[PDB]
Design a protein around this ligand. Structure first.
Ligand SMILES: Cc1[nH]ncc1-c1ccccc1Cl
Ligand SMILES: Cc1[nH]ncc1-c1ccccc1Cl
Ligand SMILES: Cc1[nH]ncc1-c1ccccc1Cl
Length: 468
């Protein structure tokens, strides 16, 4: 008999799994929300610095109304190469957000030393992709990489139809602090990463007024062979594609239909993405430069390094946030947590073809969230930034590992407003002026220099309907 070969791999469950890390796809966990798990690993935070400041360039008339299409194409061309490097080096891409991605190598404590060496090699090869690269003339296509290592907690929260996850703890905070110290072309190790690494492998230098270090070179011993070393490291990589599947970037490409697994995984993915996955919407429909209102919510914690306290508090806040968003068709696009602050990137006005009073409603939703979350046990401070304008929306990353993302100066502005103006609901000039709400509903604020923002315009606190 004939033997026609090659397994069919294009099932809905496989398409859904592209939107998720192995941490979730192969997770198998409890029905309870919140769910918490604890492990050790190495984290890599890759920032494509300056990229957002080039989303605004693609709004110009020169792109002839194909700005969003050209933006997603060039971003994915470069980000796909970074993703492929991470995946071939055995990493799990956790999330894409803003200009960045975060990857994880989960391993037992005893293997952390050797895995750091793998992750440094990976980081150097990523830099290597961009060594002789630009577009017009002064294009700064270079990345900044922070690495951290140590204890990691995962939190999964949500309701009967939606799930979200976050990674938490000192290694998570450290990786963002490390990437923030990086200049273009740097690999920065967190203090704990430098403490746990194989110091015979690397030459470092001190970072002024910091315990983190910069990697100058990976200079391995005379008898060292990276390929044979990496092979030894794969013993500890549960899902590294191997044997008959050694030609694949992810084991998740091999997932077979399983309705119970698909029910769990689809909860993490927006309904408009599922519509595209199901071939009920055109594959290009979600790449757009679209006017939206960003409502960026930050929850700061009492018992701040305490994962077992923060989990219930985030779940309780989430249950309220999702009810408020439902009424006015808002969406949670991203959640992430650093420096004991859990942030929700909420968006009013993307795939859906309508919403009339987007601004008064966005402000009222922000105040509702603010009032409720302020009364949640263990939540110390709630801060909300509200900004409105044109943002890029689209699926970013590699065919095998990508996520819907929102990118733009107004997203960065709302993020910076919630950090620089803590404990209040703030809005930009577009939102203030457009709402047509009486001026006494607001307080005009002092202008702050915000790292990353070049002229915010006037900013306002949304004071609310009453003096009290
Ligand atoms: C840089 C950027 N571009 N678009 C969004 C962002 C962002 C900035 C700070 C925190 C989180 C995010 Cl997502
Ligand atoms: C470095 C970066 N680039 N784009 C977004 C970010 C970021 C910064 C602080 C916290 C969270 C995020 Cl995602
Ligand atoms: C999921 C998460 N929890 N804490 C931080 C993050 C994160 C932040 C920025 C980019 C990617 C990720 Cl995974």
């Amino acid at each position: 008999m004939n033997t026609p070969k090659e397994e069919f791999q294009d099932w809905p469950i496989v398409r859904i799994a592209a939107h998720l890390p192995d941490l979730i796809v192969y997770g198998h966990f409890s029905p309870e929300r919140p769910f918490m798990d604890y492990f050790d690993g190495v984290l890599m935070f890759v920032d494509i610095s300056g990229f957002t400041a080039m989303t605004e360039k693609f709004s110009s008339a020169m792109y002839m109304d194909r700005g969003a299409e050209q933006l997603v194409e060039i971003l994915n061309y470069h980000i796909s190469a970074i993703v492929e490097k991470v995946l071939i080096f055995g990493g799990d891409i956790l999330k894409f957000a803003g200009d960045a991605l975060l990857a994880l190598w989960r391993v037992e404590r005893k293997q952390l030393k050797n895995i750091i060496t793998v992750v440094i090699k990976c980081s150097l090869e990523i830099h290597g992709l961009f060594e002789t690269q630009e577009w017009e003339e002064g294009l700064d296509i270079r990345v900044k990489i922070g690495l951290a290592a140590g204890h990691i907690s995962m939190l999964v929260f949500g309701d009967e139809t939606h799930s979200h996850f976050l990674v938490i703890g000192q290694a998570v905070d450290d990786v963002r602090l490390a990437q923030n110290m990086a200049q273009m072309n740097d690999v920065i190790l967190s203090p704990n990463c430098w403490q746990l690494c194989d110091r015979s492998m690397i030459e470092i230098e001190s970072v002024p007024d910091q315990r983190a270090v910069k990697v100058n070179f990976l200079k391995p011993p005379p008898n060292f062979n990276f390929d044979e070393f990496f092979t030894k490291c794969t013993t500890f990589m549960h899902y590294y594609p191997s044997g008959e599947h050694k030609n694949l970037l992810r084991l998740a490409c091999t997932l077979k239909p399983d309705p119970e697994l698909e029910m769990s995984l689809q909860k993490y993915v927006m309904e408009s993405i599922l519509k595209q996955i199901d071939n009920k919407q055109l594959q290009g429909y979600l790449s757009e430069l679209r006017p939206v209102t960003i409502v960026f919510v930050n929850l700061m914690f009492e018992d701040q390094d305490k994962a077992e306290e923060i989990g219930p508090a985030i779940q309780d806040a989430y249950m309220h946030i999702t009810s408020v968003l439902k009424i006015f068709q808002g969406q949670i696009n991203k959640v992430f947590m650093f420096d004991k602050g859990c942030s929700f990137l909420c968006v009013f006005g993307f795939p859906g073809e309508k919403v009339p009073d987007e601004l008064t409603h966005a402000l009222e939703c922000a105040m509702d969230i603010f009032d409720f979350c302020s009364q949640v046990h263990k939540i110390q401070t709630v801060s909300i930034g509200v900004a409105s304008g044109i943002v890029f929306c689209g699926i970013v990353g590699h065919t095998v590992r990508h996520e819907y993302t929102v990118i733009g100066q107004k997203v960065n502005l709302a993020a910076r407003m919630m950090m620089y103006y803590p404990g209040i609901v703030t809005c930009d000039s577009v939102t203030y002026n457009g709402s047509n709400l009486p001026a006494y509903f607001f307080k005009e604020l002092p202008k702050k220099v915000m790292k990353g923002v070049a002229d915010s315009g006037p900013l306002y606190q949304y004071w609310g309907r009453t003096e009290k």
